[PDB]
Amino acid sequence: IVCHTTATSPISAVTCPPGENLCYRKMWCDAFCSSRGKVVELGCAATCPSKKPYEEVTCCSTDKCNPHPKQRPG
Amino acid sequence: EERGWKHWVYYTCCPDTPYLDITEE
Numbered sequence: 001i002v003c004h005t006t007a008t009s010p011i012s013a014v015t016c017p018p019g020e021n022l023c024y025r026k027m028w029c030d031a032f033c034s035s036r037g038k039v040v041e042l043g044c045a046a047t048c049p050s051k052k053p054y055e056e057v058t059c060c061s062t063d064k065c066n067p068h069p070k071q072r073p074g
Numbered sequence: 075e076e077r078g079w080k081h082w083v084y085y086t087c088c089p090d091t092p093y094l095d096i097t098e099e
Contacts, residue, residue, distance in 0.1 A: 005080070005082075006082035007080025007081055008082070010094075012080055032087055038086040039086075040086050041082075041083075041084070068084060070088060070089050
């Protein structure tokens with residue numbers, strides 16, 4: 001499967017060769033609670049854990065199914 | 075010329091205020 005990520009210059013996107021092809025959408029509070037905004041990290045996992053600790057996480061298993069919310073309809 | 079690895083920080087709220095991280099010695 002395909003997958004997005006947040007790491008290089010712009011948004012990164014690669015395919016997950018192993019069994020872990022799930023695209024998670026992690027998001028917590030980084031300045032939106034303070035001043036700037038909520039944090040967002042796009043990645044590829046196999047055992048998408050629970051975001052209960054103190055954040056969010058959308059576990060999906062489709063080609064680059066981890067797109068951005070505020071960033072997309074530019 | 076340099077180019078590092080992969081480091082980002084995308085904040086929900088604003089698209090014109092992206093936090094990019096590539097290289098900075």
